[PDB]
Design a binder for this molecule. Structure first.
Ligand SMILES: Cc1cc2nc3c(=O)[nH]c(=O)nc-3n(C[C@H](O)[C@H](O)[C@H](O)COP(=O)(O)OP(=O)(O)OC[C@H]3O[C@@H](n4cnc5c(N)ncnc54)[C@H](O)[C@@H]3O)c2cc1C
Ligand SMILES: Cc1cc2nc3c(=O)[nH]c(=O)nc-3n(C[C@H](O)[C@H](O)[C@H](O)COP(=O)(O)OP(=O)(O)OC[C@H]3O[C@@H](n4cnc5c(N)ncnc54)[C@H](O)[C@@H]3O)c2cc1C
Lengths: 440, 439
């Protein structure tokens, strides 16, 4: 009776929540697999995360699932103390990872600047615009202006030298997983607020601890709890939505009447669904302009054991590349993040070699792999990141649909929105509660 | 079919988890109310937390419940910028809350000292004693030795002055909710590890954010999800757990058959239940020596609006007292924590006045209240804290029992005893143990 579109983390956790409340449901998933933009798969000789990878105990929703499904001690920190290399003036500069981190920490000071005023409760991101806001009006002015400024310009305007500008350029090419110059600096400020306003904590939360048994240990755990079979290979083509319910039509033409629809399809793939009535103009505007996520994630295998970290600014094929696994056959697997999925073939050895050649001529790529989420019609984006103006007139607009259609997914979370599974687990669960409370 | 003893946070969340898995259960609760050691109740003109109070988004289990039950924006920070007072060599020193926080930050630096080596994953507290431990043998030796050292001695040995010693004494009288000199320093080191090894984070997590609608908004939310009525006024007197299945006998003599029993009764009340077979000897030794929680929590109402913070070392009636509410009739409600429940009558105006008189003879108590959990036969303790040796030979001995599983904040891996987070953690994971067994 409640139809959930998508068996990613948001749809799976929503289904479990409805099950707890005794509400009948059905999950319809387009692919022949569950997990969505979390996808653990054997490649290049071991399980690799083609999407979601890192977790932390300061992510409440993710951590509770880690505990629930037996993974409490099954996390491992990524390699640290790497030899670092960074782009600078079209030239490669060498240093320690600590040197690089010190420069990034200095720049984050200015990047986070108004977060203490904007986000006393970092899980109430739009408090500044609410009726409860009791601060100075200049705080609200600066909040709105920061939605229209990118994170690099904050560092430029503070007087940092070109080396730091190029370092933060590379950093935010990875963090916005897209062109950082089109992004909203408020996203970075909220990451600060959720990270105790410390660069080291932000990196601990988003870029340190990996699941030994993969994200699949969590998503298969949730699916294994469900008493209703997930309908795979069942893309939704149309959603009619009204005050008392909804009608879902599949690609095969099957019509399913529903008491509510929980739609977890990401913005990059919402164009595959016809909505009747059409979604509000303000929401359609976000869908047309989408979100800040045009980049890509690669895994590269090189000969030898090398503790490597590289940064390079836009328009590099990859902007952040780091050693992740030292393999038993004297190879290293590195992960990379880049701003433009169309400038790199994740499965081309020559392109992976070009990435490595950004910093070191003498390293030799023997394998490479990745999944181009942006070119995947059921995703159309990597993790959701915000363009200018989307912090205040973007993700939150998906909550005001005056009908039994509800949007859930990491890209609409209050907390670790888009970038983390924590946001999907948060928003799937709380949207199921919206449905539960309505029915009660 | 699964019998859950106790309707505190652990038993409630375990019931919900079993319900999700389609497993029949029943909760038997001794009292006429749910919530256990979380208890939001109208007193002195407003809802006051007679047990659990503070929350944070870095507490995964608590925070997920806050999100689930609609309380995301319904948190408020306790008053700050108070005028601070501390007792040192029998004298009262005045200062700013900042001065006091700076002294405590300096002391926590040495208090947390080995936490980076012991607790890389702060949710695996016994990693050092495991077969996966791969550090130097001196790290294991230091870990074991630290279980036998109290947290104040670390500060004394580091050479801090008497003023800082008296401050940390007061602080740990509250934190150990009991005599800190009998406590295990590993507890404090794990708090550090769970708080990014920074005093300010540890205080933000445990002593800052209150629920506007009380802990009751969470425990009543969980109870409202349950499709099976909770049996109130139904104390369990006996638990049989031979390998057949299990049997529970109530005080009234009713016998209930069970596939498994999840017992959330805290150590301080476990002597009310007869277990057959007897619990393991090491568990019995913990029950006899109990846990580090003989203290008490008071709410004092004084005349006027006063931003007050006071610290005093053992054997003060209260060791940490802080303004919490400025009331509409020109009064202030303060909260206090003290190390010895038998040295204070939480409902005596004269005793509350003696507390205030530790620091300022000119403030006037007009009301006071509290619940002495230690003298409550269904608790017998405040929040669970560790005596020397109980970090490595205490809380973890209650796992793997007989088929009776123990769940409760006092056995959690993370924010054990001190936080609702630990009850929600361990109630949920113990239900998962039962689920997995049945699957
Ligand atoms: C490259 C990358 C790396 C990441 N790394 C991390 C990380 O290290 N840590 C972290 O915490 N998070 C990470 N994330 C983020 C995390 O993957 C997401 O936040 C989360 O997985 C999103 O879950 P969701 O359920 O909201 O959406 P999705 O996972 O996108 O689920 C939506 C589901 O709907 C399905 N679907 C789409 N259209 C239809 C249709 N018409 N009909 C039916 N079904 C449909 C899709 O196939 C999919 O299964 C990463 C994301 C990416 C892209
Ligand atoms: C003074 C105080 C202040 C606190 N402040 C905070 C705070 O600020 N923040 C925080 O996060 N945590 C705080 N806590 C801790 C928190 O209250 C506990 O960690 C948590 O509530 C314990 O839950 P539990 O379910 O494990 O145990 P309990 O709450 O003790 O639940 C056990 C239940 O079993 C029942 N019972 C006992 N014996 C029997 C029997 N024989 N038969 C049947 N039922 C029985 C009891 O009545 C009770 O309902 C505080 C605790 C105290 C004492």
């Amino acid at each position: 009776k409640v139809v959930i579109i998508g068996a990613g983390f948001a749809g799976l956790v929503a289904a479990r929540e409805l099950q707890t409340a005794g509400i009948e449901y059905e999950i319809l998933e387009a692919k022949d697999r569950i997990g969505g933009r979390a996808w653990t798969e054997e490649r290049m000789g071991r399980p690799l995360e083609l999407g979601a990878t890192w977790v932390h105990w300061f992510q409440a929703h993710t951590w509770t699932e880690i505990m629930r499904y037996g993974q409490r001690t099954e996390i491992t920190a990524s390699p640290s103390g790497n030899d670092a290399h960074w782009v600078t003036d079209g030239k490669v500069v060498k240093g320690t990872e600590d040197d690089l981190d010190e420069k990034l920490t200095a720049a984050m000071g200015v990047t986070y600047e108004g977060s203490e005023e904007y986000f006393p409760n970092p899980h109430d991101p739009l408090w500044v615009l609410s009726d409860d806001f009791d601060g100075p009006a200049e705080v609200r002015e600066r909040f709105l202006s920061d939605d229209q400024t990118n994170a690099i310009d904050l560092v430029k305007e503070a007087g940092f030298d070109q080396e730091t500008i190029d370092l933060v350029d590379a950093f935010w090419c990875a963090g916005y997983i897209g062109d950082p110059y089109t992004g909203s600096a408020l996203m970075a400020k909220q990451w600060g607020a959720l990270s105790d306003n410390r660069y080291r904590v932000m990196e601990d939360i988003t870029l340190k601890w990996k699941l030994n048994n993969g994200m699949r240990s969590l998503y298969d755990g949730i699916a294994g709890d469900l008493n209703t079979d997930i309908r795979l290979n069942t893309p939704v083509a149309k959603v009619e939505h009204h005050d008392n319910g909804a009608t879902v039509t599949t690609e095969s033409g099957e019509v399913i009447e529903a008491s509510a629809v929980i739609c977890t399809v990401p913005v990059g793939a919402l164009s595959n669904i016809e909505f009747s009535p059409a979604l509000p103009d303000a929401v359609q505007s976000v869908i047309d302009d989408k979100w800040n996520s045009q980049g890509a994630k690669i895994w590269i295998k090189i000969k030898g054991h090398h503790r490597f970290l590289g940064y390079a600014p836009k328009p590099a094929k990859m902007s952040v590349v780091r050693s992740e696994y030292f393999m038993d056959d004297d190879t290293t697997i590195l992960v990379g993040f880049g701003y433009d999925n169309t400038n790199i073939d994740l499965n081309s050895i020559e392109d992976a070699q070009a990435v490595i050649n950004q910093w070191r001529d003498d390293l030799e790529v023997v394998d490479t792999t990745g999944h181009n989420w942006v070119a995947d019609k059921w995703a159309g984006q990597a993790w959701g990141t915000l363009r200018k103006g989307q912090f205040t007139q973007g993700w939150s607009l998906f909550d005001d649909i005056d009908s039994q259609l509800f949007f859930a997914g990491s890209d609409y979370a209050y907390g670790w929105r888009g970038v983390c599974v924590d946001g999907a687990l948060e928003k799937g669960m709380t949207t199921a509660r919206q449905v539960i409370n309505s029915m009660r």
